[PDB]
Amino acid sequence: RDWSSPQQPFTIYGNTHYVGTGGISAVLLSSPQGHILVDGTTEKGAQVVAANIRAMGFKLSDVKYILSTHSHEDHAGGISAMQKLTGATVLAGAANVDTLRTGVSPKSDPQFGSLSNFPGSAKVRAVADGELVKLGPLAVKAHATPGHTEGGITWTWQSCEQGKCKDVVFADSLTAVSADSYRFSDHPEVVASLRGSFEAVEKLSCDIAIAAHPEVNDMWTRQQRAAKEGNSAYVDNGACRAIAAAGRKRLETRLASEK
Numbered sequence: 374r375d376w377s378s379p380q381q382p383f384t385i386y387g388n389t390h391y392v393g394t395g396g397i398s399a400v401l402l403s404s405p406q407g408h409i410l411v412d413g414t415t416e417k418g419a420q421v422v423a424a425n426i427r428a429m430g431f432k433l434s435d436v437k438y439i440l441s442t443h444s445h446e447d448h449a450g451g452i453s454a455m456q457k458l459t460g461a462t463v464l465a466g467a468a469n470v471d472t473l474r475t476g477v478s479p480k481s482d483p484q485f486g487s488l489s490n491f492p493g494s495a496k497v498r499a500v501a502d503g504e505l506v507k508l509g510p511l512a513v514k515a516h517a518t519p520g521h522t523e524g525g526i527t528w529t530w531q532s533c534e535q536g537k538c539k540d541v542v543f544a545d546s547l548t549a550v551s552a553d554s555y556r557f558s559d560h561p562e563v564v565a566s567l568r569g570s571f572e573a574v575e576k577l578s579c580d581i582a583i584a585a586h587p588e589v590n591d592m593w594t595r596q597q598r599a600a601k602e603g604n605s606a607y608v609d610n611g612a613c614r615a616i617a618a619a620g621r622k623r624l625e626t627r628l629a630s631e632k
């Protein structure tokens with residue numbers, strides 16, 4: 374389950390399909406009027422994601438938007454390639470637009486000094502907190518969830534099967550990780566941003582959570598459960614609370630370690 378590994382795609386609920394790699398989530402939200410892709414995975418992973426979209430019966434040329442959680446190689450490295458293959462517009466939080474364009478994270482990033490660059494994308498545009506992305510019948514909401522990066526966005530929508538609907542959340546990373554030379558205790562904006570983000574995420578309507586790193590909400594255990602239980606195995610309306618709690622615990626452990 375490396376970041377760039379093949380992974381047979383699968384439908385999670387309704388028109389929400391997992392098209393990511395073995396290690397990094399990417400989601401296609403489909404419609405007859407075109408599709409939205411969330412994240413690109415790695416540069417090498419773009420070829421996996423593209424093949425997976427086609428394996429689900431969809432055309433790349435019908436992907437109209439690519440939504441970015443945040444601008445690190447593991448989630449965004451494949452966006453540039455996907456953008457070329459699709460012609461889509463890339464949407465991101467304001468403070469991550471320049472990073473997506475260039476593929477270089479800035480000095481404000483806690484991991485600056487330790488990150489690998491990734492390919493810059495074309496057609497990158499900003500969205501604001503609370504903003505709706507509409508495409509035909511699709512409606513995806515942006516929630517600012519800064520901390521891991523300044524422009525991190527968590528994306529939400531509803532998917533339905535014969536009128537039975539669920540609230541789906543593609544949860545951005547909420548993790549306090551850094552270069553060796555970085556002290557969170559010296560950077561109050563980052564700490565405040567992380568804390569605000571745990572609070573936002575634990576309040577979301579959240580039947581089905583798909584974490585950027587899929588194991589964060591036990592995707593693979595859930596998929597194994599689903600073989601017998603069906604797609605209810607993906608449903609757990611405490612998942613966003615649990616992702617937020619794990620974020621909080623990581624930060625609190627880190628601040629304690631810094632004293």
Ligand SMILES: C[C@@H](O)[C@@H](C(=O)O)[C@H]1C[C@H](SCCNC=N)C(C(=O)O)=N1
Pocket residue numbers: 445446447484488521546547548550585586589
């Ligand atoms: C560039 C880094 O951000 C990347 C790396 O290993 O290089 C990893 C580290 C953390 S934590 C990874 C697993 N998730 C834990 N909650 C992470 C993320 O939370 O998105 N990505």
Ligand code: NA
Pocket residue numbers: 378379380381382421424425
């Ligand atoms: Na694959």
Ligand code: NA
Pocket residue numbers: 452453454456457493494495496
């Ligand atoms: Na591009």
Ligand code: NA
Pocket residue numbers: 437460461462496
């Ligand atoms: Na476009």
Ligand code: NA
Pocket residue numbers: 441442443444464465466469524525526
């Ligand atoms: Na973003």
Ligand code: NA
Pocket residue numbers: 444468469472478479482522523524
């Ligand atoms: Na950034």
Ligand code: NA
Pocket residue numbers: 444445469472477478479482522
């Ligand atoms: Na960044």
Ligand code: NA
Pocket residue numbers: 474494495496497498
């Ligand atoms: Na651009």
Ligand code: NA
Pocket residue numbers: 483484520521522548549550551
């Ligand atoms: Na971080």
Ligand code: NA
Pocket residue numbers: 545546547548586589
């Ligand atoms: Na994470």
Ligand code: NA
Pocket residue numbers: 554555556557559
């Ligand atoms: Na520091």
Ligand code: NA
Pocket residue numbers: 554555556
């Ligand atoms: Na520093």
Ligand code: NA
Pocket residue numbers: 587588590591592593594595
């Ligand atoms: Na798992």
Ligand code: NA
Pocket residue numbers: 602603604605606
């Ligand atoms: Na079921």
Ligand code: NA
Pocket residue numbers: 605606608609
């Ligand atoms: Na269930």
Ligand code: NA
Pocket residue numbers: 605606607608609
């Ligand atoms: Na369940």
